[PDB]
Structure formats: C-alpha cells, structure tokens
PDB file of C-alpha atoms in Angstrom:
ATOM      1  CA  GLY A   1     122.715  -6.874 -95.171  1.00  9.59           C
ATOM      2  CA  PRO A   2     122.706 -10.039 -92.479  1.00  9.14           C
ATOM      3  CA  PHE A   3     120.773 -10.458 -90.171  1.00  8.98           C
ATOM      4  CA  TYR A   4     121.165 -10.151 -86.791  1.00 11.40           C
ATOM      5  CA  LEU A   5     122.005 -13.150 -86.015  1.00 13.04           C
ATOM      6  CA  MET A   6     121.960 -16.424 -88.074  1.00 13.60           C
ATOM      7  CA  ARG A   7     123.061 -19.490 -87.997  1.00 11.57           C
ATOM      8  CA  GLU A   8     123.821 -22.663 -89.406  1.00 13.18           C
ATOM      9  CA  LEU A   9     120.636 -25.200 -89.470  1.00 11.79           C
ATOM     10  CA  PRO A  10     120.904 -28.644 -89.540  1.00 12.98           C
ATOM     11  CA  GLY A  11     122.153 -32.088 -91.448  1.00 13.13           C
ATOM     12  CA  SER A  12     119.451 -31.604 -94.072  1.00 14.49           C
ATOM     13  CA  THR A  13     117.388 -34.915 -92.719  1.00 10.87           C
ATOM     14  CA  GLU A  14     118.977 -36.049 -89.858  1.00 11.57           C
ATOM     15  CA  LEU A  15     117.136 -39.064 -88.119  1.00 11.63           C
ATOM     16  CA  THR A  16     113.289 -37.969 -87.178  1.00 10.40           C
ATOM     17  CA  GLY A  17     110.277 -38.574 -86.169  1.00  6.87           C
ATOM     18  CA  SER A  18     108.996 -37.618 -90.068  1.00  5.78           C
ATOM     19  CA  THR A  19     110.862 -40.775 -91.223  1.00  2.00           C
ATOM     20  CA  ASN A  20     109.162 -44.458 -91.547  1.00  3.01           C
ATOM     21  CA  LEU A  21     111.055 -46.521 -88.492  1.00  4.66           C
ATOM     22  CA  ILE A  22     109.938 -49.501 -88.937  1.00  3.56           C
ATOM     23  CA  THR A  23     111.193 -50.105 -92.376  1.00  2.51           C
ATOM     24  CA  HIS A  24     114.232 -48.667 -91.678  1.00  4.31           C
ATOM     25  CA  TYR A  25     114.734 -50.462 -87.948  1.00  4.46           C
ATOM     26  CA  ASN A  26     114.048 -53.339 -90.164  1.00  6.36           C
ATOM     27  CA  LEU A  27     110.940 -55.076 -88.048  1.00  9.11           C
ATOM     28  CA  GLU A  28     108.878 -54.413 -91.827  1.00  8.34           C
ATOM     29  CA  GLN A  29     107.362 -57.547 -92.819  1.00  7.56           C
ATOM     30  CA  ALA A  30     107.183 -58.946 -88.563  1.00  6.44           C
ATOM     31  CA  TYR A  31     103.842 -56.228 -89.192  1.00  4.60           C
ATOM     32  CA  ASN A  32     102.967 -58.124 -92.662  1.00  2.00           C
ATOM     33  CA  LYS A  33     103.197 -60.929 -90.700  1.00  2.00           C
ATOM     34  CA  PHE A  34     100.980 -59.647 -87.704  1.00  2.00           C
ATOM     35  CA  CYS A  35      98.932 -56.886 -89.449  1.00  2.00           C
ATOM     36  CA  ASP A  36      94.703 -67.280 -79.182  1.00  2.10           C
ATOM     37  CA  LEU A  37      98.001 -69.269 -78.200  1.00  2.00           C
ATOM     38  CA  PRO A  38      96.010 -70.902 -75.706  1.00  2.05           C
ATOM     39  CA  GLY A  39      93.530 -72.185 -78.587  1.00  2.00           C
ATOM     40  CA  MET A  40      96.694 -72.683 -80.666  1.00  2.00           C
ATOM     41  CA  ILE A  41      98.182 -74.158 -76.836  1.00  2.00           C
ATOM     42  CA  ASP A  42      95.037 -76.659 -77.047  1.00  2.00           C
ATOM     43  CA  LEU A  43      95.825 -78.185 -79.941  1.00  2.00           C
ATOM     44  CA  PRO A  44      98.090 -79.664 -78.281  1.00  2.00           C
ATOM     45  CA  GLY A  45      96.347 -80.551 -75.636  1.00  2.00           C
ATOM     46  CA  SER A  46      92.532 -80.667 -74.038  1.00  2.00           C
ATOM     47  CA  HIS A  47      92.066 -77.087 -73.161  1.00  2.00           C
ATOM     48  CA  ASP A  48      92.710 -73.320 -71.746  1.00  2.00           C
ATOM     49  CA  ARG A  49      93.866 -72.957 -59.326  1.00  2.00           C
ATOM     50  CA  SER A  50      94.576 -71.607 -62.696  1.00  2.00           C
ATOM     51  CA  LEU A  51      93.890 -68.514 -59.716  1.00  2.00           C
ATOM     52  CA  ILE A  52      96.622 -70.653 -58.082  1.00  2.00           C
ATOM     53  CA  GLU A  53      99.601 -70.564 -59.857  1.00  2.00           C
ATOM     54  CA  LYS A  54      99.165 -66.988 -61.422  1.00  2.00           C
ATOM     55  CA  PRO A  55      99.737 -66.399 -58.055  1.00  2.00           C
ATOM     56  CA  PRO A  56     102.781 -67.399 -57.421  1.00  2.00           C
ATOM     57  CA  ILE A  57     104.188 -66.518 -60.871  1.00  2.00           C
ATOM     58  CA  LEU A  58     102.662 -62.713 -59.725  1.00  2.00           C
ATOM     59  CA  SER A  59     105.364 -62.311 -57.303  1.00  2.00           C
ATOM     60  CA  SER A  60     108.664 -63.643 -59.262  1.00  2.00           C
ATOM     61  CA  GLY A  61     114.954 -86.362 -53.746  1.00  2.00           C
ATOM     62  CA  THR A  62     112.454 -87.278 -57.541  1.00  2.00           C
ATOM     63  CA  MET A  63     113.381 -91.044 -56.816  1.00  2.00           C
ATOM     64  CA  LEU A  64     112.942 -90.229 -52.647  1.00  2.00           C
ATOM     65  CA  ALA A  65     110.203 -88.490 -53.140  1.00  2.00           C
ATOM     66  CA  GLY A  66     108.188 -91.441 -54.935  1.00  2.00           C
ATOM     67  CA  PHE A  67     108.906 -94.183 -52.351  1.00  2.00           C
ATOM     68  CA  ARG A  68     108.270 -91.642 -49.272  1.00  2.00           C
ATOM     69  CA  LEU A  69     104.541 -91.491 -50.530  1.00  2.00           C
ATOM     70  CA  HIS A  70     102.773 -94.342 -51.835  1.00  2.00           C
ATOM     71  CA  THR A  71      99.647 -94.050 -52.903  1.00  2.00           C
ATOM     72  CA  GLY A  72      96.094 -97.107 -52.590  1.00  2.00           C
ATOM     73  CA  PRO A  73      95.161 -98.003 -55.906  1.00  2.00           C
ATOM     74  CA  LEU A  74      91.458 -98.659 -54.984  1.00  2.00           C
TER      75      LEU A  74
ATOM     76  CA  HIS B   1     114.458 -75.380 -78.312  1.00  2.00           C
ATOM     77  CA  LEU B   2     114.796 -78.577 -76.436  1.00  2.00           C
ATOM     78  CA  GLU B   3     113.639 -77.055 -73.675  1.00  2.00           C
ATOM     79  CA  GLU B   4     110.271 -76.507 -75.232  1.00  2.00           C
ATOM     80  CA  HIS B   5     110.115 -79.827 -76.685  1.00  2.00           C
ATOM     81  CA  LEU B   6     110.940 -81.556 -73.468  1.00  2.00           C
ATOM     82  CA  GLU B   7     108.194 -79.591 -71.721  1.00  2.00           C
ATOM     83  CA  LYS B   8     105.635 -81.011 -74.604  1.00  2.00           C
ATOM     84  CA  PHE B   9     107.020 -84.403 -73.953  1.00  2.00           C
ATOM     85  CA  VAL B  10     106.261 -83.879 -69.809  1.00  2.00           C
ATOM     86  CA  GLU B  11     103.099 -81.627 -70.929  1.00  2.00           C
ATOM     87  CA  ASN B  12     101.847 -85.405 -72.163  1.00  2.00           C
ATOM     88  CA  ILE B  13     102.932 -88.230 -70.459  1.00  2.00           C
ATOM     89  CA  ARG B  14     101.123 -86.252 -67.479  1.00  2.00           C
ATOM     90  CA  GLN B  15      98.033 -86.181 -69.434  1.00  2.00           C
ATOM     91  CA  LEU B  16      98.608 -89.532 -70.593  1.00  2.00           C
ATOM     92  CA  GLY B  17      98.949 -89.965 -66.199  1.00  2.00           C
ATOM     93  CA  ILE B  18      95.964 -88.680 -65.413  1.00  2.00           C
ATOM     94  CA  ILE B  19      93.409 -90.575 -68.023  1.00  2.00           C
ATOM     95  CA  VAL B  20      95.000 -93.694 -67.357  1.00  2.00           C
ATOM     96  CA  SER B  21      94.470 -93.174 -63.594  1.00  2.00           C
ATOM     97  CA  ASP B  22      90.513 -90.769 -65.014  1.00  2.00           C
ATOM     98  CA  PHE B  23      88.884 -94.696 -63.953  1.00  2.00           C
ATOM     99  CA  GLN B  24      91.070 -97.338 -60.923  1.00  2.00           C
ATOM    100  CA  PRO B  25      94.111 -98.721 -61.958  1.00  2.00           C
ATOM    101  CA  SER B  26      94.079-102.746 -61.680  1.00  2.00           C
ATOM    102  CA  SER B  27      97.900-102.233 -61.715  1.00  2.00           C
ATOM    103  CA  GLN B  28     101.129-101.189 -59.913  1.00  2.00           C
ATOM    104  CA  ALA B  29     100.728 -97.041 -59.202  1.00  2.00           C
ATOM    105  CA  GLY B  30     103.953 -96.116 -59.361  1.00  2.00           C
ATOM    106  CA  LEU B  31     104.094 -95.797 -62.986  1.00  2.00           C
ATOM    107  CA  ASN B  32     102.205 -92.215 -62.582  1.00  2.00           C
ATOM    108  CA  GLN B  33     104.996 -91.718 -59.489  1.00  2.00           C
ATOM    109  CA  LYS B  34     108.136 -92.345 -61.421  1.00  2.00           C
ATOM    110  CA  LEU B  35     105.259 -89.665 -64.489  1.00  2.00           C
ATOM    111  CA  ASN B  36     105.582 -87.573 -61.964  1.00  2.00           C
ATOM    112  CA  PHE B  37     109.633 -87.701 -61.110  1.00  2.00           C
ATOM    113  CA  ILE B  38     110.023 -87.659 -64.865  1.00  2.00           C
ATOM    114  CA  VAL B  39     108.003 -84.685 -65.558  1.00  2.00           C
ATOM    115  CA  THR B  40     109.248 -83.380 -62.056  1.00  2.00           C
ATOM    116  CA  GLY B  41     113.409 -83.702 -63.067  1.00  2.00           C
ATOM    117  CA  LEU B  42     112.620 -82.181 -67.278  1.00  2.00           C
ATOM    118  CA  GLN B  43     111.139 -79.129 -65.477  1.00  2.00           C
ATOM    119  CA  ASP B  44     113.931 -79.087 -63.945  1.00  2.00           C
ATOM    120  CA  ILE B  45     115.764 -78.583 -66.415  1.00  2.00           C
ATOM    121  CA  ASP B  46     114.198 -76.129 -68.505  1.00  2.00           C
ATOM    122  CA  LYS B  47     114.426 -74.463 -65.713  1.00  2.00           C
ATOM    123  CA  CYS B  48     118.384 -74.070 -65.601  1.00  2.00           C
ATOM    124  CA  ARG B  49     118.165 -73.740 -69.136  1.00  2.00           C
ATOM    125  CA  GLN B  50     115.913 -70.774 -68.629  1.00  2.00           C
ATOM    126  CA  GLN B  51     118.577 -69.050 -65.787  1.00  2.00           C
ATOM    127  CA  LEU B  52     120.527 -69.897 -68.710  1.00  2.00           C
ATOM    128  CA  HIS B  53     119.335 -68.283 -70.884  1.00  2.00           C
ATOM    129  CA  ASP B  54     117.877 -65.411 -69.250  1.00  2.00           C
ATOM    130  CA  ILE B  55     114.418 -64.446 -70.662  1.00  2.00           C
ATOM    131  CA  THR B  56     113.874 -60.711 -70.054  1.00  2.00           C
ATOM    132  CA  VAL B  57     110.564 -60.033 -70.063  1.00  2.00           C
ATOM    133  CA  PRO B  58     108.047 -57.780 -68.866  1.00  2.00           C
ATOM    134  CA  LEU B  59     104.658 -57.749 -66.486  1.00  2.00           C
ATOM    135  CA  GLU B  60     101.879 -56.862 -68.832  1.00  2.00           C
ATOM    136  CA  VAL B  61     102.422 -59.852 -70.974  1.00  2.00           C
ATOM    137  CA  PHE B  62     101.954 -62.026 -67.673  1.00  2.00           C
ATOM    138  CA  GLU B  63      98.649 -60.358 -67.490  1.00  2.00           C
ATOM    139  CA  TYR B  64      98.093 -61.774 -71.254  1.00  2.00           C
ATOM    140  CA  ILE B  65      99.180 -64.489 -70.292  1.00  2.00           C
ATOM    141  CA  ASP B  66      96.671 -65.089 -67.335  1.00  2.00           C
ATOM    142  CA  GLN B  67      93.836 -64.894 -69.657  1.00  2.00           C
ATOM    143  CA  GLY B  68      96.223 -67.227 -71.924  1.00  2.00           C
ATOM    144  CA  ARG B  69      95.631 -65.942 -75.062  1.00  2.00           C
ATOM    145  CA  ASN B  70      98.176 -66.496 -77.869  1.00  2.00           C
ATOM    146  CA  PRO B  71     100.565 -63.297 -78.697  1.00  2.00           C
ATOM    147  CA  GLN B  72      99.943 -63.138 -82.003  1.00  2.00           C
ATOM    148  CA  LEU B  73      97.088 -60.710 -81.210  1.00  2.00           C
ATOM    149  CA  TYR B  74      99.439 -58.914 -78.784  1.00  2.00           C
ATOM    150  CA  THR B  75     101.782 -57.467 -81.347  1.00  2.00           C
ATOM    151  CA  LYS B  76      98.544 -57.187 -84.486  1.00  2.00           C
ATOM    152  CA  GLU B  77      97.571 -55.397 -80.978  1.00  2.00           C
ATOM    153  CA  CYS B  78     100.875 -52.935 -81.104  1.00  2.00           C
ATOM    154  CA  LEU B  79     101.650 -52.248 -84.422  1.00  2.00           C
ATOM    155  CA  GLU B  80      98.602 -50.954 -84.692  1.00  2.00           C
ATOM    156  CA  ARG B  81      98.345 -48.874 -82.279  1.00  2.00           C
ATOM    157  CA  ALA B  82     102.570 -47.613 -83.562  1.00  2.00           C
ATOM    158  CA  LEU B  83     101.219 -47.013 -86.724  1.00  2.00           C
ATOM    159  CA  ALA B  84      97.571 -44.695 -85.938  1.00  2.00           C
ATOM    160  CA  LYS B  85     101.157 -43.339 -84.128  1.00  2.00           C
ATOM    161  CA  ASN B  86     102.894 -42.869 -86.718  1.00  2.00           C
ATOM    162  CA  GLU B  87      99.709 -41.993 -89.440  1.00  2.00           C
ATOM    163  CA  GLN B  88      99.036 -38.648 -87.163  1.00  2.00           C
ATOM    164  CA  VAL B  89     102.608 -38.022 -86.627  1.00  2.00           C
ATOM    165  CA  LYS B  90     102.831 -37.710 -90.183  1.00  2.00           C
ATOM    166  CA  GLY B  91      99.447 -36.110 -90.299  1.00  2.00           C
ATOM    167  CA  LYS B  92     100.844 -33.051 -87.872  1.00  2.00           C
ATOM    168  CA  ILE B  93     103.785 -32.988 -89.468  1.00  2.00           C
ATOM    169  CA  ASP B  94     102.720 -32.118 -93.471  1.00  2.00           C
ATOM    170  CA  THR B  95      99.839 -29.611 -91.201  1.00  2.00           C
ATOM    171  CA  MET B  96     103.009 -27.411 -90.174  1.00  2.00           C
ATOM    172  CA  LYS B  97     104.483 -28.146 -92.761  1.00  2.00           C
ATOM    173  CA  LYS B  98     102.212 -25.956 -95.938  1.00  2.00           C
ATOM    174  CA  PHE B  99     100.033 -24.598 -92.814  1.00  2.00           C
ATOM    175  CA  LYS B 100     104.378 -23.114 -93.484  1.00  2.00           C
ATOM    176  CA  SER B 101     104.573 -23.014 -96.786  1.00  2.00           C
ATOM    177  CA  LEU B 102     101.426 -21.534 -97.372  1.00  2.00           C
ATOM    178  CA  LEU B 103     102.550 -18.910 -94.826  1.00  2.00           C
ATOM    179  CA  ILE B 104     105.464 -17.617 -97.172  1.00  2.00           C
ATOM    180  CA  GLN B 105     103.573 -18.195-100.430  1.00  2.00           C
ATOM    181  CA  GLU B 106     100.812 -15.645 -98.653  1.00  2.00           C
ATOM    182  CA  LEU B 107     103.462 -12.482 -97.604  1.00  2.00           C
ATOM    183  CA  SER B 108     105.391 -13.200-100.550  1.00  2.00           C
ATOM    184  CA  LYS B 109     105.574  -8.874-101.143  1.00  2.00           C
ATOM    185  CA  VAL B 110     106.003  -7.704 -97.475  1.00  2.00           C
ATOM    186  CA  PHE B 111     109.917  -8.071 -98.764  1.00  2.00           C
ATOM    187  CA  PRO B 112     111.689  -9.765-101.454  1.00  2.00           C
ATOM    188  CA  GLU B 113     114.888  -9.125-100.654  1.00  2.00           C
ATOM    189  CA  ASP B 114     114.028 -11.451 -97.850  1.00  2.00           C
ATOM    190  CA  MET B 115     112.246 -13.652 -99.385  1.00  2.00           C
ATOM    191  CA  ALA B 116     114.935 -14.474-102.171  1.00  2.00           C
ATOM    192  CA  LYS B 117     117.413 -14.177 -98.854  1.00  2.00           C
ATOM    193  CA  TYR B 118     115.629 -16.514 -96.947  1.00  2.00           C
ATOM    194  CA  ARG B 119     115.063 -18.766-100.897  1.00  2.00           C
ATOM    195  CA  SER B 120     118.928 -19.225-100.199  1.00  2.00           C
ATOM    196  CA  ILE B 121     119.513 -20.301 -97.189  1.00  2.00           C
ATOM    197  CA  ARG B 122     117.082 -21.877 -96.951  1.00  2.00           C
TER     198      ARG B 122
ATOM    199  CA  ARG C   1     113.354 -61.661 -65.463  1.00  2.00           C
ATOM    200  CA  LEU C   2     111.782 -64.938 -66.116  1.00  2.00           C
ATOM    201  CA  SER C   3     114.300 -66.698 -64.111  1.00  2.00           C
ATOM    202  CA  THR C   4     112.649 -65.880 -60.602  1.00  2.00           C
ATOM    203  CA  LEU C   5     109.918 -66.487 -62.581  1.00  2.00           C
ATOM    204  CA  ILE C   6     111.907 -70.418 -62.947  1.00  2.00           C
ATOM    205  CA  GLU C   7     112.776 -70.794 -60.093  1.00  2.00           C
ATOM    206  CA  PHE C   8     109.508 -69.672 -57.813  1.00  2.00           C
ATOM    207  CA  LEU C   9     107.130 -71.869 -59.928  1.00  2.00           C
ATOM    208  CA  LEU C  10     109.194 -74.617 -59.385  1.00  2.00           C
ATOM    209  CA  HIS C  11     109.510 -73.595 -55.987  1.00  2.00           C
ATOM    210  CA  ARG C  12     105.500 -73.908 -55.716  1.00  2.00           C
ATOM    211  CA  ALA C  13     105.712 -77.030 -58.298  1.00  2.00           C
ATOM    212  CA  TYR C  14     107.773 -78.941 -55.847  1.00  2.00           C
ATOM    213  CA  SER C  15     106.153 -77.944 -52.137  1.00  2.00           C
ATOM    214  CA  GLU C  16     102.326 -78.410 -53.694  1.00  2.00           C
ATOM    215  CA  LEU C  17     104.017 -82.221 -55.183  1.00  2.00           C
ATOM    216  CA  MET C  18     105.911 -82.472 -50.941  1.00  2.00           C
ATOM    217  CA  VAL C  19     102.086 -81.940 -50.428  1.00  2.00           C
ATOM    218  CA  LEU C  20     100.058 -84.080 -52.302  1.00  2.00           C
ATOM    219  CA  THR C  21     102.395 -86.880 -51.867  1.00  2.00           C
ATOM    220  CA  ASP C  22     102.235 -86.485 -47.854  1.00  2.00           C
ATOM    221  CA  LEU C  23      98.182 -86.250 -48.032  1.00  2.00           C
ATOM    222  CA  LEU C  24      97.616 -89.161 -50.379  1.00  2.00           C
ATOM    223  CA  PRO C  25      99.190 -92.130 -48.013  1.00  2.00           C
ATOM    224  CA  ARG C  26      96.238 -90.455 -45.152  1.00  2.00           C
ATOM    225  CA  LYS C  27      93.631 -89.622 -47.071  1.00  2.00           C
ATOM    226  CA  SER C  28      91.180 -91.792 -48.994  1.00  2.00           C
ATOM    227  CA  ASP C  29      91.427 -93.789 -53.072  1.00  2.00           C
ATOM    228  CA  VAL C  30      89.465 -91.201 -54.658  1.00  2.00           C
ATOM    229  CA  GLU C  31      90.782 -87.659 -52.490  1.00  2.00           C
ATOM    230  CA  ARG C  32      94.168 -88.935 -53.556  1.00  2.00           C
ATOM    231  CA  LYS C  33      93.600 -89.773 -57.034  1.00  2.00           C
ATOM    232  CA  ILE C  34      91.378 -85.814 -56.690  1.00  2.00           C
ATOM    233  CA  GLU C  35      94.258 -84.416 -55.237  1.00  2.00           C
ATOM    234  CA  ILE C  36      96.795 -85.781 -57.839  1.00  2.00           C
ATOM    235  CA  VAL C  37      95.334 -85.428 -60.858  1.00  2.00           C
ATOM    236  CA  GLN C  38      93.963 -81.460 -59.407  1.00  3.76           C
ATOM    237  CA  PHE C  39      98.436 -81.621 -58.952  1.00  2.16           C
ATOM    238  CA  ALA C  40      98.699 -82.294 -61.997  1.00  2.00           C
ATOM    239  CA  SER C  41      95.815 -80.509 -63.634  1.00  2.29           C
ATOM    240  CA  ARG C  42      97.941 -77.008 -62.104  1.00  2.00           C
ATOM    241  CA  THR C  43     101.067 -78.249 -63.742  1.00  2.46           C
ATOM    242  CA  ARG C  44      99.480 -78.713 -67.126  1.00  3.58           C
ATOM    243  CA  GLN C  45      98.273 -75.290 -66.306  1.00  2.31           C
ATOM    244  CA  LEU C  46     102.132 -74.218 -65.464  1.00  2.00           C
ATOM    245  CA  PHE C  47     103.607 -76.234 -68.396  1.00  2.00           C
ATOM    246  CA  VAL C  48     101.462 -73.759 -70.372  1.00  2.00           C
ATOM    247  CA  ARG C  49     102.977 -70.727 -69.336  1.00  2.00           C
ATOM    248  CA  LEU C  50     106.174 -71.557 -70.411  1.00  2.00           C
ATOM    249  CA  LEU C  51     105.728 -72.328 -72.985  1.00  2.00           C
ATOM    250  CA  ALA C  52     103.808 -68.736 -74.125  1.00  2.00           C
ATOM    251  CA  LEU C  53     106.523 -67.211 -72.683  1.00  2.00           C
ATOM    252  CA  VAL C  54     109.359 -69.099 -74.551  1.00  2.00           C
ATOM    253  CA  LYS C  55     107.022 -68.338 -77.313  1.00  2.00           C
ATOM    254  CA  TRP C  56     107.257 -65.373 -76.903  1.00  2.00           C
ATOM    255  CA  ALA C  57     111.024 -65.323 -75.762  1.00  2.00           C
ATOM    256  CA  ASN C  58     111.820 -64.375 -79.577  1.00  2.00           C
ATOM    257  CA  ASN C  59     108.870 -62.853 -80.497  1.00  2.00           C
ATOM    258  CA  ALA C  60     110.587 -59.868 -78.268  1.00  2.00           C
ATOM    259  CA  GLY C  61     111.549 -57.652 -80.837  1.00  2.00           C
ATOM    260  CA  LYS C  62     107.862 -55.671 -82.154  1.00  2.00           C
ATOM    261  CA  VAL C  63     107.181 -55.063 -78.627  1.00  2.00           C
ATOM    262  CA  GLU C  64     110.207 -53.076 -77.672  1.00  2.00           C
ATOM    263  CA  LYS C  65     110.158 -50.708 -81.450  1.00  2.00           C
ATOM    264  CA  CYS C  66     106.752 -50.447 -80.700  1.00  2.00           C
ATOM    265  CA  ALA C  67     107.315 -49.026 -77.909  1.00  2.00           C
ATOM    266  CA  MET C  68     109.997 -47.033 -78.160  1.00  2.00           C
ATOM    267  CA  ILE C  69     108.658 -45.883 -81.179  1.00  2.00           C
ATOM    268  CA  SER C  70     105.848 -44.707 -78.611  1.00  2.00           C
ATOM    269  CA  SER C  71     108.231 -43.139 -75.707  1.00  2.00           C
ATOM    270  CA  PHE C  72     109.607 -41.362 -78.216  1.00  2.00           C
ATOM    271  CA  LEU C  73     106.311 -39.688 -79.999  1.00  2.00           C
ATOM    272  CA  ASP C  74     105.718 -39.058 -75.686  1.00  2.00           C
ATOM    273  CA  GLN C  75     108.392 -37.669 -74.999  1.00  2.00           C
ATOM    274  CA  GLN C  76     109.212 -35.556 -77.975  1.00  2.00           C
ATOM    275  CA  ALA C  77     105.387 -34.431 -76.961  1.00  2.00           C
ATOM    276  CA  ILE C  78     106.105 -33.039 -74.094  1.00  2.00           C
ATOM    277  CA  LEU C  79     108.902 -31.108 -75.986  1.00  2.00           C
ATOM    278  CA  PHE C  80     106.504 -29.067 -78.261  1.00  2.00           C
ATOM    279  CA  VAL C  81     104.196 -27.735 -75.189  1.00  2.00           C
ATOM    280  CA  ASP C  82     106.745 -26.937 -73.384  1.00  2.00           C
ATOM    281  CA  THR C  83     108.346 -24.873 -76.329  1.00  2.00           C
ATOM    282  CA  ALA C  84     104.126 -23.547 -75.570  1.00  2.00           C
ATOM    283  CA  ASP C  85     104.292 -22.755 -72.057  1.00  2.00           C
ATOM    284  CA  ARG C  86     107.587 -21.581 -72.051  1.00  2.00           C
ATOM    285  CA  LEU C  87     106.011 -19.251 -75.169  1.00  2.00           C
ATOM    286  CA  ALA C  88     102.874 -18.314 -73.626  1.00  2.00           C
ATOM    287  CA  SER C  89     104.810 -17.881 -69.810  1.00  2.00           C
ATOM    288  CA  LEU C  90     107.408 -14.509 -71.535  1.00  2.00           C
ATOM    289  CA  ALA C  91     103.731 -13.458 -73.344  1.00  2.00           C
ATOM    290  CA  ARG C  92     101.873 -12.881 -69.891  1.00  2.00           C
ATOM    291  CA  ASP C  93     104.967 -12.335 -67.424  1.00  2.00           C
ATOM    292  CA  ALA C  94     107.421 -10.657 -69.491  1.00  2.00           C
ATOM    293  CA  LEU C  95     106.141  -8.061 -71.954  1.00  2.00           C
ATOM    294  CA  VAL C  96     103.919  -6.152 -68.680  1.00  2.00           C
ATOM    295  CA  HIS C  97     107.553  -5.800 -66.951  1.00  2.00           C
TER     296      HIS C  97
END
C-alpha cells in the first residue's frame, strides 16, 4: 500500500531561490534607478601623488604650526 | 550630513587659496596659512565625525575610487550581474521543472496507481 | 573599516603639512609655492576620496544585496555538484562491491 520510507515534504513555498529575491528584499526601486562621480566631483571643482594618497590609504597645533613656518611672498 | 558640507567648503577654500597663490601675492602670505589651518581643523572634525559614525567599507571600493568614478555605475553593474544570475537561476529552475513534468506525463502508463498516489500526495 | 583609513589619511596629511612648512623657509619662494600647491592638490585628492566614501556610505545596501544573492547561488552551487558527485561516487564504488 504505502511505499517504503515515505515522509512529509517541506512547507509548500518557503524561502527559495525561485522567488524574486530583490523585490522581496525591497531593493527594486534602486535597481530601476540604476539600470563618473569623479566628474560629479569635477563639476564641484576643476578636474578629477594621487599615487601617494592611494598608498597612504592602502595601509588602512594649527595656530602653532602657522607661526613656526614662514614662506617668502616673493 | 554636515561633514560633507565642511569638506566641500574646505576644498573650495583650498582651491581659492591656490588660485590666489598661483601668481605673486602682493598682500601678506599668512592668509594661505590660515586657510590651511582651517582646512586641517575641518578635516580633523570630519575624521572625528567619521570615527563616531563608524562606516564600514570593503577594498574593491578602494580600488574603484583609486581610478576615480562615481559609485552609481558600480551599483548599476552589481544590479545587472545579480539580475543575470537571477535569470539564469530562473532558467535552470524552469528547465528542471519542465523536464520533471515531461518525464511524469511521458510515463503515465507504467503504473496508474503510482501516478494516482503521486498526484494525491503531491 | 573607514575609521583606520581616515586616521591614517589624517596622519599622512599632518606629516605632509609639517614637512612642507619646514621645507618652505629653507627653500626659495618658487620652490615653496610649488610644494604648497602640490600639497593642496594632494589634500584635494584626499578630500574627493573622502567625499566619494561618504556618498557611497548610504549606497551600501544594493551592493550588499547583490553580493549575498551571488553568494547564495554560489553556496548552493557547491551543494548541487556535491550531491551529483555523491551519486557518481556511489555508482563507481558501492555498486562494484
């Protein structure tokens, strides 16, 4: 009658990979928006050791300082 | 937030000071030093604000900033590659589903009771 | 992860400012001006990097969603092949015995 070792299948539709995971995860409108900021940055300034700054970031007395160093005007 | 506005103001002040100091300044040279001190203070305030906020960033963002480009294109690329992965997953899912359906209906005649029990249990 | 980078950038900028201030009085006017404008350009690069970071700081959600979705599929991908491998392994060895 019953086959050997039948059991209960899981809950009908739990979390799968067959759902639309983005729309369930409330990320739809960002994608529908999305589908240079240096340029964005460029608009604010002029253009966009840049070799040196990256190296510094790779690893990761204001009044007194002014008084200490004097630079000739001409 | 106020940190971004402070950084933009400091950058504008530095640009104005550079424009003033590009030629020979007939006035006193302490204005550039004062602007640099104000920029350093604003940078310290921004660093304190960032330490309080505790933003976590990966490395790929760092090498993406290194070239110089807005993150909107990167988010678009991430969205499109995730959508492509979702579409191919949907494709494999529907192919295995239709393969299951065709093998079920193809051999419906081998044992009618087994198919009846399978449809009843589902 | 940005706190250490911010602290390192602040330390590097402070060291560069101190070095430029010390070098300016010894060097001539033109060399001092060139060093100051180069330091200003480097600080501007640091500022725009910080601006890009703080602009992406609120745009860290969708990338995380895409990454976790890709990982889920990848994590799942190891599982289907493993099951297939087990079936393949059984036919080759278990059946023979």
